[PDB]
Amino acid sequence: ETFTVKMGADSGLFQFEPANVTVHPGDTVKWVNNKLPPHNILFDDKQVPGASKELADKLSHSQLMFSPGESYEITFSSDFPAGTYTYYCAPHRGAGMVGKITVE
């Protein structure tokens, strides 16, 4: 299954929608740039399973997305550790533009 997460609410809120997504191994999360850019998608090293910086860095999309419809996806294949992957948008961090992917 692919779960889409809007970056920016349709109504002009600096939020990921849905902020929390539960996925199973093999599922994909697709972020779509919707409203109020720029956005990015950052996982801190201590915010992924096992606190792996290698993993968190590979998954982070630190570059800023400005154009509507720009996208980034992660397929949480069976080779990903189960657990929570908590992320945030740096440009809108102060607005609480955060989310969490729970694998399994």
Residues of the binding site for Cu cation: 39, 89, 92, 97
Binding span for Cu ion by CB under 5 A among 25-33, 44-52, 74-82, 93-101: 93-101
Please say if 7 is a catalytic residue: no
Please say if 61 is a catalytic residue: no
Contact call for residue 44 and Zn ion (CB under 5 A): yes
Whether the Cβ atoms of residue 69 and residue 33 lie closer than 8 Å to each other: yes
Question: With respect to Zn ion, which residue has the nearer C-beta, 17 or 45?
Answer: 45
Largest CA distance in the chain: 37
Q: Where are the beta strands (DSSP E) in the chain?
A: 2-7, 16-17, 20-23, 27-33, 39-43, 61-65, 71-76, 83-88, 98-103
Q: How far is the CB of 34 from Zn ion (least distance, A)?
A: 27
Binding-site member from 45, 57, 70, 73 for Zn ion (CB under 5 A): 45
Task: Please tell me the distance from the alpha carbon of residue 9 to that of residue 56, in angstroms, as a whole number.
Answer: 25
Give me the active site residues, please. 39, 89, 92, 97
Question: Rule CB under 5 A: which residues touch Cu ion?
Answer: 39, 89, 92, 97
